[model samples]
Target: KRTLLFKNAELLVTMDDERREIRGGCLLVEGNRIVAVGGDELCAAPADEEIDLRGHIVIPGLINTHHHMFQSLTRVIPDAQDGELFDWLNNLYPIWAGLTPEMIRISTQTAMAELMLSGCTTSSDHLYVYPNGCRLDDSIDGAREIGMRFHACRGSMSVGRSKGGLPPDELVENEQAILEDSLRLIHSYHDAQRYSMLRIALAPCSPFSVSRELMVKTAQMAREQGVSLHTHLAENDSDVSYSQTHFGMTPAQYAEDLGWVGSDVWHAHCVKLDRAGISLFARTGTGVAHCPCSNMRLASGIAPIRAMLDEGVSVGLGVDGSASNDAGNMIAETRQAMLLQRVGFGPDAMNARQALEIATRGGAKVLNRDDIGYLATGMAADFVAFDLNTLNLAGAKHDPLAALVFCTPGNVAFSVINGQVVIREGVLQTIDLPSVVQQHNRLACLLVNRHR
Candidate 1:
């Protein structure tokens, strides 16, 4: 079996069940699985490759539960910066309608590159708009080129402005076509095995942008196919108003009525969950993908993560769309999740250790995975290392976990996904970052002028 060894880490935060923080540790990997995790003396096996973790800290690779990869085309738009959720989407809808295959490819690579440099190994992207023959395949190809484990959520929009939805008509799909494509994607991808690098999820955009019938149908189909369900729910006032006007039910009730209550489903942006909704989620074992930066960007309220966690609801972190969050920095997302929870629930409500837990273990729960979150025997060898010697952690030298969350969001020095080094020495070993960035910038500029 192929093996690699990590020796002499200054600190190793496993983010495991025990939240173990070993002062000097070593990690041993065999093939795509972790063979050992403990102090140096505990793992004495020889290795084909040995990495020195001197003056650095190793942790499970950060996981992003929800994002919009193609939305990287629109960032910090002058007209949409100060707008709230509905107004922001209204301003950006026309621009998104101009998405092409080339733009989707470039934006997907761009976002993945940014995420990898920021220490994310696994990410789930919701690409709901498919304009000009753009399909999830574009994003899949980009992920392959980048070598990061990806969940290419086949996100769909079936209700347009003509049907009282938030998006434009050109950006929505026919309901029948959406269901068919969802099935096709799940059958083609979605490996429910150990250490899965690629998976397919069914996301019907959001409550305001998709019909209740579509949501129910998608949920049924996902359950039938044994795949996971994802969508945006209770995110902002638009969803609340839509539910109030259309069905007279709260967003949580609407989702429950549509058969979306279970461990197999996770919704994005529950910034408006009430006590009742939180209780329902907890009781039903439902999951929430908390996206703090995007909520702050659109002036959407922060998620009640402390309440959710207290109530036993599964919670994970998301960077959200680059259009909404303005960047694809997963490490920053973890930090934001921590800071927001602290703002609402005092300092002890959320700590650096728990915040990292959301990014790793919590994300695995959202994706319904058991293989890749922890650094332990039989777990996937997916992890990242940060240089403790960096200036960003100068003052937090004594606190490695604090340095990771409270310190400046710094770049990762190394990342291994599935026992392979996808990022080494802060540079992408799988793709040419400069070339993709240049291509992405060109398309982004053209898209702005054409649709702005």
Candidate 2:
């Protein structure tokens, strides 16, 4: 591996523990690691690749804590536009049941391309729906083709309508079959090494769609194999009631009883977690994926992220499924998270640095990995740079970081992942975005109009 030097940056916001910011900075990358990051005087020998990011602000790459990559095919479905979360899913599940291998490929690429454009080099995708040959490998393969680091969870659903579940019988698999495939995927793709590009988690869609037995067994399997566990939890009022009605307990107690509350677990859309649940999560070091846009879009109540953070909970921003939010822009989602927290807490709550932290360090904590989040020595060379001269940062010149958080979200100038440049000059360098867009549009139109 040769050394590559990134030189002469206007500002380098290294979101490390100390939150250091350098006025004129340079860094050296050897293979997949950042060997050095500091003032220009730190440079020693000539590097293999020299990128002059003049007047650009360099920061650690944004990490997406949660997403349904294949939902790109069902974004903004008309039937789900004005309904609550349960109703939205009821109307959209039929459309999702029509997913094919080609649809999965195109949809994953579309979501990945949008995420890359938003300066997200590392992302966690939860695709539990497997219809017509759509498996976890399809999405992981799509991530590899686009040159992004991925934590692709082997998501599953075992209970269907025949067994008092939300999904149709055809859409659900046998519990034993789901477990076997999960083991196969973990053996085939789960990498535990530092800075690994791929890893697999056991994510059984949600409490409503998966049996309690499966959830408990999945958590046990994940713990035994030393992998992570994930699922949807407590998004709205109805979800909480459903948990109480079915399990005779709140969502938090249900998770705790099942041995699913731990450091290696992250639940998506924890909107209705109460004070006790918040304390439990904080003490256990469990994480939450706060998807404000999707919550509001589907009329799900706002997640108590402000309260969760106050209790020292690990919270990261998520764009959620595209069928609800209709967008996969992580940067935009960061701003929405900040505003939503403020609306709940106060005006002084949730600043830009905190929001940006959710996109970086918070996400790293959620994914239970330390090697790919910070822009420090020995960390992965996964970061992004935005041209300060752009129109987006013209007026908020006093503080660039503040401008980024408070301002409207926009595409980043460059995105790099693990020493590999993925997006340059606001365009995807590894994959053809235009090609994916065309194919995704055609497939989505064809599938949405057809019935299963």
Candidate 3:
């Protein structure tokens, strides 16, 4: 096994059981597993590679619990910019209908590159809309190249406007084909072991775009296969209203009625989840992906994160999509999550460290993975660092760990995933980032102009 060591960090914030922070921290990795982590003790450990991160804050790599990576290509469209959740999807669904396999591949890399630069090591992407020859495999292929530990959610949208659903008919797939393809992707990609680089999840888009029968069946299939389930729930008031009018029940009630409430299931947004919903989630150990920026951007109300956490509900951060949040910076999202709660509750609602915990360890709990969220002896070798001396972080050097979430610092100074350096000296090492960005722009313009 290859060995690597990172030592002398300004501060290593380990989101471990102890919530430990080691000054001048050292971490040793053999193969893909962390072997040792501490203060000066690991400085003498021999390794094939070593680096001194003397002026940087090293933290467990941030985890993104939910995203639509393919939407990275459709960012900042004027018509979709100032709309709510339903209108936003309506405005962009047709434009997304023009996507192809090449679009999916490049967008996945583009999204992952942005995420990596911003200190994310593991991410779950929901790619539900497959327009023209766009397979979930295209996304997996891109993730493999970018080297981000990925949860490739095989997302599907079946019910359409013609069938009293929200999405256009052409963007929706047949239920049978969705099930068959979901199984294929699961058997082909899911790795239910420690330190896995990739896994597959089953996500039906949402209540408005998927049939009731599909949710029940998807939940059954996921349980039988031992895969996790994910989908959007109660994103905004209209989402809740849709559930109320269509099913005569709240989103949470509908979810429970269909076997969608469990430790193996995670729902996105939940901005409109009331006390009952929160109780259900907490009791059943279901998880929530709190997308603060996306909720704000789309005028979706703030999620009851403080209540959820207080009730012992699993909570994590998600950037949503570049189309909604219009950015995929995990560190920035962490800050947003902290501040969004303070906007509703008092400033004491959340602290920087608490937000970082959600972005790291809490995300791990949501994904049903215990291995990669923190720095420990047997944890996955995934972590990221940012220079404290950077201009944006200049005045906040006293609290190096808090500076990352407090300031608007961008791009990681160094990152190691699976014992390999993917970013060094603020440069992404996994892919041709500039070329991918260029192609992504061309493709984005093609879709927009084609729609025009």
Candidate 4:
């Protein structure tokens, strides 16, 4: 690891305790940790490499708390395009069943490339659908090569349509096999120390796709092994009805009975969490991964974000599965999150800075990380820069930080993850992206056509 000095930032927004914003700023990184962050004083610091970022605004790398990276390979299939959650699953389950480990690896790389170019340095992927010969290792191996900090959730679906679950029989797995493989992956990959680039969380796909007993066992296994738990809950009317008719309770009530409420657990979607559910989540320190684009894309109702924040619940942004949102742009997601609050609540519900906070620091909290969300000394060297001198931001210079969330989002000019420049000057330097895109298209066609 070599020292890298990022000098000459036009402005640096540090989402620190005091919410510090610096102009004419520079940051110094030694190995994989920030050593200093200040104005011109850091320009003269000794370093093995120096990158000048003149006229660019710097901020902590955006964090994505939820995503289904493998779904990048299945984006925009016509049959699945215009349906809600239940209908959408029915149309795509068989297509996903044709996936190979290679498909998982390539799709993970593709999604992470999009995330890195959009200024996201760390992302949590919820890969619950495993078909063909895929394993969590496929995604994990791909993320390491891309040089992004990742939370590789070991996701499983142990109930099929034959067992009254959402997924068809071919896509589900045996409960014992799922738990055994989860334990193996945890021992092989889970890292809990500060600044760990990889960790594992046990994610049972969702209530409709998994049995109640499996959820209970997964919750117990995750806590006993000191890992996190993740799932989908109360995403829409159909999601809620499934829980009520099957378990005689709401999704949140079922979660409580299964002991799935705590800081170590975070649920995705949550678009239909009611007042009682929100109170339960806030009181128990349960976090929510809000995917506004996904909710709207599937016609799911707006989540009660403003009320949740007011009640002291932790909320983070998620790019979700590409099949749901059709894209993976963290800044675009940030802007949507901000505007959706204003539309549903009021103009005062959320501001530009507040939205970025949720995308960065708020996501770090949801993922249980204390080392990478904010720019500070002793923190991991993870941050991104966006060129301010762009057409989209031409007249928005009055506030460069606000311009980021208000203007049309664009690629990050530069991004450093764990002290490595993965994206430089708006181009990904980690892999041959063009080559991956070509391969992904071929695989996606084959997988979708295999079911035909």
**Model 4 bad stretches (over 4 Å):** none
RMSD in order of candidates: 1.4, 1.3, 1.1, 1.1
For model 1, how does the per-residue alpha-carbon lDDT over 337-408 read when each residue is reduced to its tens digit?
888888887978898878888899999998888887778888999999999988788878889878888987
TM-score of predicted structure 3: 0.98
Compared with the true structure, all predictions reach lDDT values of 0.87, 0.86, 0.91, 0.90
Give the 10-residue window scoring lowest on summed lDDT in candidate 3.
80-89
lDDT for residue 404 in candidate 4, whole number 0-100? 93
Query: Order of candidates by lDDT, top first?
Result: 3, 4, 1, 2
User: lDDT score, residue 105, model 3?
Assistant: 92
Candidate 3 lDDT tens digits, 1-452: 99998999989998888989999999999999899999888988999998999999999999999999989888888878875666777888988999999999999999999999999999999999988889999999999999999998989999888887777887999998999999999899899988899898999998567777888888889999999999999988887887899889999999999999998999999999999999999999999999999998888888989999999999999999889899999999999999999999988889999999999989999999989899999999999999988899978988988888888997999999888899999999989889989999998888787843
Candidate 4 matches the true fold with a TM-score of: 0.98
Tens-place lDDT per residue, model 4, 289-313, is: 9999998888887899989989888
Q: CA lDDT of 64 in candidate 3?
A: 97
Segments of candidate 1 deviating more than 4 angstroms: none
Model 2 regions more than 4 Å off:
none
Top candidate by lDDT: 3
Residue 447, candidate 4: C-alpha displacement in angstroms: 1.2
